Design an enzyme around this catalytic site. Structure first.
Site, mmCIF file in Angstrom:
data_model
loop_
_atom_site.group_PDB
_atom_site.id
_atom_site.type_symbol
_atom_site.label_atom_id
_atom_site.label_comp_id
_atom_site.label_asym_id
_atom_site.label_seq_id
_atom_site.Cartn_x
_atom_site.Cartn_y
_atom_site.Cartn_z
ATOM 1 N N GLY B 69 -30.624 5.701 1.127
ATOM 2 C CA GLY B 69 -30.410 4.779 2.224
ATOM 3 C C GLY B 69 -31.346 5.026 3.388
ATOM 4 O O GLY B 69 -31.119 4.530 4.496
ATOM 5 N N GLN B 70 -32.403 5.796 3.147
ATOM 6 C CA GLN B 70 -33.373 6.091 4.189
ATOM 7 C C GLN B 70 -34.179 4.843 4.538
ATOM 8 O O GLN B 70 -34.322 3.916 3.735
#
Ligand SMILES: Nc1nc2c(ncn2[C@@H]2O[C@H](COP(=O)(O)OP(=O)(O)OP(=O)(O)O)[C@@H](O)[C@H]2O)c(=O)[nH]1
Ligand SMILES: [Mg+2]
Lengths: 142, 180, 10, 200
Positions: B69-70
């Protein structure tokens, strides 16, 4: 709501008729004749919108038989066209390759579908599959 | 032509299926994938790139491609969207600030014509604290009930406990495979 | 003729 | 609500619920059922827009509550298809008929101007109807379409010509009356037999 919706052919013959306003038979016939004459005496670049008798007389036929609607001047014009297109698609799905000949033979079926779709000139079935399923279930009853 | 070989393969099980691992960072997506593949809560560094793993259940090898989810890895999920049949969204019920970001990412992923055959797979991650919402509040906040033409189901799964992962896997298998 | 043609051609 | 105004206050309490429902519907841009031409639940969206326009038409709280929904719909809706154009027209009409913000009015005016230049007869008729409805409201902003109104009188569409004539008649003020008198006389002299009496 839709005051009256009638399906009239190019030659002037009417294949459908459904008026939501109680009018005299002679008056209704005169109104239908006037609507047919206006549609029959209108070009293809008229926008398919006619303000006749303070009514949004929208004519839009995708084939030789045309369709006309009469709604009050309180809603958007594109809504009537979208409703007409949705009704045409639903009728085509219910019948299958709907033509002018099939419309005359299926007048009772077309009237039943119109009644189950729009009642009193207002939209009654927003979905396209629910109305078809209900029509099929009603037909299968006998 | 003859389909005797296909029938023989299907008699003992030939279907495998697929799955996707997407969601916000720290949402348990990597933990969920590890539990599906291995079955233990192992601490790992943040997924800078992506994690590829396969889980065999019910005679079907549902491979899950974990995606971090970066910010630098969020736009890289489009690479795995090609030749992908499933999509799993990892929700963070314990991250109210990141809840909006996760919802926006899920909407962006589901707003692509390429990702249309993959049904919605929302897992209520972080189901270990009292602050976690139920299976209906999260769906209502994310608006999963209004996603027409998508088989989205809200399931609560806790990475530490492992409960609810079997239900999510069964739901994904039912959405993908519709046989006896 | 023109009547056997589909209304929408679908 | 339209039959009597006694239920307007009672029916105005459900404005947040209607706004939430509209936002949820807009969030899902696709629809397996009722989704035609890329617009999901176009009838539901039209009904919601009509309720918002008719709800809180003379109140600030109702307009403010639905201001965000109207702004989102005015920018999160695509008018490529007929359903999208109808939804945009309904949203513009609701904004004009309600006490919306200056930005909402400017966006509605821009949408009406863009739809006026559309070559579609139905689109032109819808734009003319919206301009005629928004005659008293945003009258100064409607003066920027004087050239379009004048050109619509010479259009080859009976409905389009009638809409242009009505817009020109409704846009006559105390300063452009003298200038518009020559245009009106020219239109009456070279008008259709059914429009000569109306023009006079
Ligand atoms: N300790 C604990 N952590 C949980 C629990 N549920 C979800 N988590 C989160 O799961 C994360 C595990 O990290 P990762 O293995 O890297 O997987 P991830 O959540 O997708 O994080 P990224 O891979 O970097 O995107 C932890 O950082 C927690 O924030 C739980 O019940 N207990
Ligand atoms: Mg991970």
């Amino acid at each position: 709501m839709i005051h009256f919706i009638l399906l009239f052919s190019r030659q002037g013959k009417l294949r459908l008729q459904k008026w939501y306003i109680t009018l005299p038979d002679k008056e209704r016939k005169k109104i239908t004749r006037e609507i047919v004459q206006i549609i029959l005496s209108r070009g293809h670049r008229t926008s398919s919108f006619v303000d006749w008798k303070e009514l949004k007389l929208v004519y839009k036929r995708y084939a030789s038989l045309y369709f006309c609607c009469a709604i009050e001047n309180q809603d958007n014009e594109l809504l009537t066209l979208e409703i007409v297109h949705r009704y045409v698609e639903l009728l085509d799905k219910y019948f299958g390759n709907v033509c002018e000949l099939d419309i005359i033979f299926n007048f009772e079926k077309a009237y039943f579908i119109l009644d189950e779709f729009i009642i009193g000139g207002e939209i009654q079935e927003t979905s396209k599959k629910i109305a078809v399923k209900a029509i099929e279930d009603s037909d299968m009853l006998q | 032509g003859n389909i005797f070989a296909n029938l023989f393969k299907g008699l003992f099980g030939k279907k495998e299926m697929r799955i996707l691992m997407v969601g916000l960072d720290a949402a348990g997506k990597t933990t969920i994938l590890y539990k599906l593949k291995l079955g233990e809560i192992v601490t790992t560094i943040p997924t800078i790139g992506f994690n590829v793993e396969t889980v065999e259940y019910k005679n079907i090898s549902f491979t899950v491609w974990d995606v971090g989810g970066q910010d630098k890895i969020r736009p890289l999920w489009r690479h795995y969207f090609q030749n992908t049949q499933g999509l799993i969204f990892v929700v963070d019920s314990n991250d109210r600030e990141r809840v909006n970001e996760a919802r926006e990412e899920l909407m962006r992923m589901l707003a692509e014509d390429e990702l249309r055959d993959a049904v919605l797979l929302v897992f209520a991650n972080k189901q270990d604290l009292p602050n976690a919402m139920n299976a209906a509040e999260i769906t209502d906040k994310l608006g999963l009930h209004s996603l027409r033409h998508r088989n989205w189901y809200i399931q609560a799964t806790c990475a530490t406990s492992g409960d609810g992962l079997y239900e999510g896997l069964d739901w994904l298998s039912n959405q993908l495979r519709n046989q006896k | 003729k023109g009547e056997n043609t589909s209304l929408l051609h679908p | 609500c339209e039959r009597s105004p006694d239920m307007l206050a009672h029916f105005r309490k459900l404005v947040p619920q209607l706004v939430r429902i509209l936002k949820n519907l807009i969030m899902s841009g696709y629809s397996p059922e009722h989704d035609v031409s890329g617009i999901s639940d176009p009838f539901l969206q039209v009904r919601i827009l009509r309720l918002l326009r008719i709800l809180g038409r003379n109140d600030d709280d109702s307009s403010e509550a639905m201001n965000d929904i109207l702004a989102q719909v005015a920018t999160n809706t695509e008018t490529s298809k007929n359903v999208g154009n109808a939804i945009l027209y309904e949203t513009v009409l609701t904004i004009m008929d309600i006490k919306s913000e200056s930005g909402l009015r400017v966006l509605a005016i821009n949408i009406l101007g863009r739809f006026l230049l559309n070559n579609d007869k139905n689109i032109r008729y819808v734009a003319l109807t919206s301009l005629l409805k928004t005659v008293q409201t945003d009258h100064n902003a409607v003066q920027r379409h004087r050239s379009t109104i004048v050109d619509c009188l010479k259009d080859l569409d009976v409905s389009i010509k009638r809409r242009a004539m009505e817009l020109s008649f409704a846009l006559v003020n105390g300063n452009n009356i003298r200038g518009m008198m020559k245009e009106l006389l020219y239109f009456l002299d070279s008008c259709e037999p059914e429009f000569k009496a109306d023009c006079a």
